Backbone:
């Protein structure tokens, strides 16, 4: 990796350039009494102690010949800081950036940014991750229903209709529900209620469904739209669905792992504050 000089001086200059300060603020989920914000970028000795949790004194004060992990880690911490200029950061957010960039515990930019923004806006990042994971998990569940129906026709060399003779993705029974009100409270329903509907006639009455085509072609989901969709497919798309399902499954798996890693980080942060 490259040569560097003092990480302390580098960060001090950056937060000055970008008009950032970093403060410990009261957290109602952790602290017993409310206290005034403690600005740690106003106390260089305290800032050095915080950096020393992650870095050796050598890097903090003098720089040196950094390994690739460290050079890349510092670059990433700087980019996270620069992404939220003119802000009073919470220390927990800055420490999360450090922890999830410099250590063996790694979270990718997409998820780490969600965490950091939550912390900086005085939220509970655990709650934010849970909410995101629930939506992704429900979208994946819907895709698994679609995949199962496709695979049935592929196995039988048959023809799946994804339009007016589609399975109805709004049928609670596809997701294990036996009560409509309970289904309407589900993460699945929250996705499905945003989807286009197709009108079909049953026994001379109109019935609304969410067709496979309605769902797949919709922009209002994490995986985005599939285009050029036909009303039926014969096996005497399935690749695109498999790709989207794999992408979605990856994101869901990473959110899941991020919840475990954030739990551990919060324990570490609490431990470090005790030493401060």
Residues:
């Amino acid at each position: 990796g490259h040569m560097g000089s003092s990480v302390l001086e580098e960060l001090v200059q950056l937060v000055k350039d970008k008009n950032i300060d970093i403060s410990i603020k009261y957290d109602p989920r952790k602290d017993s009494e409310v206290f005034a914000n403690r600005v740690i970028t106003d106390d260089i000795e305290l800032l050095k102690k915080i950096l020393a949790y992650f870095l050796p004194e050598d890097a903090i004060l003098k720089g040196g010949h950094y390994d690739n992990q460290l050079q890349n880690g510092i670059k990433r911490v700087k980019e996270f800081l620069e992404s939220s200029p003119n802000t009073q950061w919470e220390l927990r957010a800055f420490m999360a950036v450090m922890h999830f960039s410099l250590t063996a515990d790694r979270i990718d930019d997409d998820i780490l940014k969600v965490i950091v923004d939550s912390m900086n806006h005085h939220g509970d990042a655990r709650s934010k991750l849970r909410e995101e994971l629930a939506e992704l998990t429900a979208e994946l569940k819907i895709y698994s229903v679609i995949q199962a129906e496709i695979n049935k026709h592929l196995s039988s060399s048959g023809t799946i209709n994804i339009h007016d003779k589609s399975i109805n993705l709004m049928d609670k029974n596809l997701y294990g529900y036996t009560d409509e009100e309970i289904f309407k409270a589900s993460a699945e329903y929250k996705i499905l209620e945003k989807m286009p509907q197709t009108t079909i006639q049953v026994d001379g009455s109109e019935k609304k469904i969410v067709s496979i085509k309605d769902f797949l072609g919709s922009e209002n989901k994490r995986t985005g739209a599939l285009g050029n969709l036909k009303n039926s497919y014969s096996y005497n798309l399935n690749d695109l669905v498999s790709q989207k399902t794999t992408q979605l499954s990856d994101i869901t798996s990473r959110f899941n792992s991020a919840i475990e890693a954030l739990n551990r980080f919060i324990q570490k942060y609490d431990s470090v504050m005790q030493r401060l």
User: Anything to note?
Assistant: The chain is about 55% helix and 10% strand. Residues 1-276 form one domain.
